[PDB]
Symmetry: D2
Subunit: 408 residues, 4 copies
């Protein structure tokens, strides 16, 4: 086990090293504790839900998934949020996606109040017989369109209800699979069908204090490779023109595309972002978030340009090849330590150096900061917030495996 | 030498092949007539211009030389087209800088365009100048640099309005800035707020859409400016939609594997119009001559299938000084035209019906068969009907122009 | 329906057009006849096979007779003489078999069918969809019991391939593809590739006559659930093929974004024996779309034709599309490959080479662009008709008839 | 200025943190000492050389200036390293061309290397010359051009052999050719057969391996040569293995998303050795200064984990003239060293055992935790132990060198 004295000793030296270059480590940690991550429930049960890799101990019930999310949050320092999918409804009533009621989410409101977290929401527009040739809201079939418009409206009603009960705004994220496997003839009509359907879904006004909608594009998915109706361009344009949030998932863009570039091109025009951190490995593979170039650039671009107050950070990944609870903790800690490293830069001075075109100083300093003692500040943050330091939280995972997961 | 009676015979056979699948070749050729390509002047003289005086022989050095070279290229491109100018192609014996240009400095090109029977489009020149400070112009943090380039931007609109009034054809005034960073920036926000404010100042003075409208061209990366581009595609799509201006899509300026033909149908539920710059990137923004490849085929079929040509200006953008510079224009223009024509020769209404009814088998079979239908016989007919050489034959014209003009310079 | 005399007339015109630029259309069609495509059996039944019991289209093959019938139908619409690729799991026997107990006689069904059909056979060992796939690893597993099982399958694939080649009197290319790799970032990249090297050497050790069979080795950049590391890389297998005097398999879907596999041929053939070129359309990943006439296919085919590599390159199809008529999928991909080969053959290649050696890049650009709108379709139509296959749209009639007669009824038919 | 006591206090805590997970920080630093980086001379003078006479002040213009600049950079990079020369950095009062260079023309650099205490690597110069014809050299279809560049190739080996004999350290002699086509070629075979025959002629005359060995460097594409590269990565890996020579991997010269760290373990079952050129591509072969990024982290940890450093020569390759050219070297060298050191500070024996047991949970958790272990405290200790400044402090040295030397030029 890491000795708390060691953490304290390493921190006092780190505090001094950072002070010498005009950085306040105490202030950086206070900033980090204001950034909640929206932890996605569906990693816990391989997005099975309750309505309808192979590591042991998958959650099978609401109680099991709630316990698994409690365990993960207990190993993530600070206070965070949980994302639900519509299919995580908890009810003994026969429901379909077009007959869900707000009170079907009472279980999760009760849990969130006990846990002390806000909730965000996702409509479930997939894994259903009413998905016709990979299309839902923007299907050429009006029966199919009408079904999914009913689900869209219900997702807003559920979100409003949760937000009213919790006293925290529910971000209601819309993702559709809609597109073509092979090359389409008509690219225009599907996107005009989507525009009309979305305008219908958001028509009935709901209190902004309770919920606001975000819209998530994708470049391509398995079996839908050639055309995505809801493109990044379509949804940025839609978000700006309908005054809604735009969702950027770090896994859903071109090879070499840097999603951290988008923020400063959006915010002159738009309201807010839902930034979904996810690791693509050569496709939309939904690998666990790790400290890599993409995460470092996402977190430092939000910190440096002061966009955190208008940017919701959510996790999105599946990994069933590893301990599903560990997966949440790896991804959240990676995101947090990347935010903290960005906060531990002399940003005001670096901005002035850059304004004066001192590219020599900018390169030298940004490179030196990558080997400054940011880990000592992160360890101090973990310890101050009653979470295990470094390798130590593996003990907690092993105990949870023995006591809970391996007994299922 | 192709025999005209052979071209006519092969056309009548192709007309019948296409009629049998519900395609009217006569109508397709009338549709192609209505698509003018904006031919870029700067391929003729390696963007030297006249304002501030590969290695194939016969580069244009004077206005008369460049005007003659563009006349020769247009004589080998069937139908009616347009020419793009850069501000540095001003023709004047007065001492000018980019911030002191006057509309009359372009009288030479208005007179030439009237003679040639073509419209003109325009480009402000925001590069190759001492007032480019650390690769930044309009959105420089230096207010002296900003104010210089804002004066040029305002003057570009004044010139474009004047040309548009004189020609009675709308001048599309394309804005491209190099502005960005070689290496990783700290502040991505402030440069884009500087750009927003400066662009708003440039477009402030009211001018009639009838004479000119501005288009805004983004870039992912350029040589020596690799890490950050102030004017991103997202920034300019947002700006064009917000300010009711045109958005410029250059086929060479996007990510590896990015299909710019995807953008049109995501723009037109929101925006006014496009300036589509066809250009061949080879693994970077290399500005190769446009050829009939996946990208050009997808750009052209996406515009005709979805009926966007009436709101899309098509311009050429490439440099190739390793080949006959006049030939480069004709290859690019003909590649674009035959690609448009192939898209127009599809049974688009029936294919749309089959796709709406989820018959993806028929869509795949038919779209593949159409690639080996006799579209060439229709293209040859279009060339001959518009008094241009067929197939290989226009190399004779290039060789003669080399002998008579280019090789004597 | 096209009129045969219309096709013949359009051909005579195209023949004259090409003759005027020094191209012999008669000779081009004779060259195309000499390129057999190895049509993959597994598109017919979504790689189910018969050993262990995206797309939805009716009429999936469920039995050897049904698959054989489906391949016969597809081949009847593909002009000329071709080959069929088998997978080990397409063994036909009443005897209870595993991948390490298959016998050459288990492929007598396919030998008899190939002889009747007038096609050669290529072979693929099946190193996937099996309980003995341990953490996505087979031949190069760190578990010696798993390694040994898959080495037994590897040796059996060669014995089967040798037997088939002897019976058919046509060399069987025996293609090796392994899924082996990691989902996430590995610590040790060296040891898995040393385990692979040793296991492959053990599989090929016992000599078999080259006239009957030779092995080819297929690399991959990444697969679903195995994204971060592939034990059998393209570099590993090109090195292995050259050093062990075996063929190298290039699958057009298995490389980096923007990677042009047509670049590889001329860097391989100064050193290596032969290629198995697997034409496949990737759409943003290894999606195994039906082959279409696109930049990649045009470049693969013209690079093989221009540089005279067809005599040392076996061309196979590899794609999976169950969202469309599975029989039509074969015909689209086969015809796209053939018409792309034929367009390449209809170029004045000797003169274009001379112009290029003289650095006449102007003539090269103009002529290569003009050739894309020469009447290559009229030569393709003539080739289709001469080889008793339908012209252009006409083969959709044959597919609709096969749907009525076979595919739309098949699910309700008793399996036997 | 960082206090040595701060470095020592942080190191003692880090040493304990690492000891607790079975990692020996003292041993890791001894391992880093055995990895010399081959610092490229041509960053110092923007590849001008002396043979054929960004815009940051103080460019080196003479041998003494460039030698001084390399001494300054090496004085700020901890440990012992090497310097790479290009043929155009010949130092002589004699009239030379690339085909008349003599080994004694490098006596200047042998003497400098001995007094500096470094080994030398070598590069033939196959660019920026009238005898580069249509971007081709050794593999030109013109036998006059081929023969000129074959003579330079043979001379590069004679020079490398002579330097190796004098220094008693093997000179790695790296071959890079620009040879290729701007646009799509008809014949891909014949250029590569011309290259094969020409390279074989260059290496024909036996020279002692104790003095020199050749390495062969491929490229995917270069500016003005985008469509085809005669010397491909496949060609040269095949050539190196076949002719028992070294293969050069430049991290900037591959496809988008290509991970060159994948190549090592596919090469070493077959080949003799590598020359790894660390370089940062930004969307093309842009030759940015090496920084601590995914590519550098993967390159360094792949060499360390699989024990390939003793068969892999690590060289720098970048040119950035927009910043202090001496600082560029130090940023790139320190980035490479701290990335090697982080990889050396992992419990690799135990992680390999975990991975063999398919414990992917433990592998993910530990590899992520190690990214925020105190590797900087070990790096700082390495800097201090080897008499170089810690962290930001070496900017003081650069500012002093600017004042005293560079800005006086
Ligand atoms: C969310 C829901 O709200 C009311 O119906 C009650 O307080 C109930 O107990 C609670 O679960
Ligand atoms: C070579 C070719 O063979 C068939 O296609 C026909 O007989 C045709 O007339 C002839 O040109
Ligand atoms: C599960 C589903 O996956 C989609 O690709 C997308 O990332 C959505 O946000 C998520 O709800
Ligand atoms: C010459 C200049 O080049 C730029 O890259 C861009 O394409 C502009 O549109 C053009 O005006
Ligand atoms: C079905 C299997 O798929 C692999 O990805 C590869 O393409 C192999 O060649 C094939 O046998
Ligand atoms: C001995 C003979 O060698 C060939 O190169 C090839 O590898 C054959 O398969 C093998 O049987
Ligand atoms: C300067 C030259 O640049 C090339 O692109 C390559 O990287 C060579 O190694 C180097 O010698
Ligand atoms: Mn998402
Ligand atoms: Mn995803
Ligand atoms: Mn452009
Ligand atoms: Mn361009
Ligand atoms: Mn394959
Ligand atoms: Mn594939
Ligand atoms: Mn290099
Ligand atoms: Mn480089």
């Amino acid at each position: 086990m890491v000795k708390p004295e060691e953490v304290d000793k390493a921190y006092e030296v780190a505090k001094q090293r950072y002070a010498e270059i005009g950085v306040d480590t105490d202030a950086a940690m206070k900033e980090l504790e204001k950034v909640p991550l929206s932890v996605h429930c569906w990693q816990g049960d391989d997005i099975h839900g309750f309505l309808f890799g192979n590591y042991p101990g998958i959650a099978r019930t609401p109680d099991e998934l709630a316990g698994d999310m409690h365990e993960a949050l207990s190993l993530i320092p600070g206070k965070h949020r949980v994302q639900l999918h519509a299919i995580y409804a908890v009810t003994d009533k026969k429901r379909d996606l077009d007959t869900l009621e707000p009170e079907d989410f009472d279980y999760w409101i009760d849990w969130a109040k006990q846990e002390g977290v806000g909730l965000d929401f996702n409509g479930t527009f997939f894994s259903h017989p009413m998905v016709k040739d990979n299309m839902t809201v923007s299907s050429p079939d009006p029966k199919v369109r009408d079904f999914w418009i009913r689900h869209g409206k219900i997702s807003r009603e559920i979100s409003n209800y949760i937000g009213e009960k919790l006293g925290s705004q529910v971000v209601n994220n819309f993702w559709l699979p809609d597109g073509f496997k092979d090359n389409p003839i008509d690219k225009k009509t599907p996107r005009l069908r989507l525009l009309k359907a979305l305008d219908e879904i958001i028509k009935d006004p709901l209190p902004e204090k309770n919920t606001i909608e975000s819209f998530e594009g994708k470049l391509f998915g398995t079996g839908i490779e050639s055309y995505t109706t809801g493109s990044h361009e379509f949804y940025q344009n839609y978000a700006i023109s309908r005054n809604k949030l735009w969702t950027i998932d770090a896994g859903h863009f071109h090879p070499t595309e840097d999603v951290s570039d988008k923020f400063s091109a959006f915010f002159p025009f738009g309201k807010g972002l839902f930034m979904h951190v996810s690791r693509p490995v050569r496709w939309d593979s939904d690998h666990v978030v790790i400290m890599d170039d993409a995460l470092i650039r996402i977190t430092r671009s939000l910190v440096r340009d002061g966009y955190l107050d208008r940017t919701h950070i959510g996790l999105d990944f599946f990994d069933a090849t590893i301990n599903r609870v560990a997966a949440w903790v790896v991804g959240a800690r990676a995101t947090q330590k990347s935010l903290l490293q960005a906060m531990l830069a002399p940003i005001d001075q670096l901005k002035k150096d850059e304004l004066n075109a001192d590219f020599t100083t900018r390169l030298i300093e940004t490179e030196e900061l990558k080997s400054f003692p940011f880990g000592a500040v992160w360890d101090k943050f973990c310890q101050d917030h009653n979470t295990p330091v470094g390798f130590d939280w593996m003990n907690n995972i092993h105990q949870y495996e023995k006591d809970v997961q391996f007994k299922r």
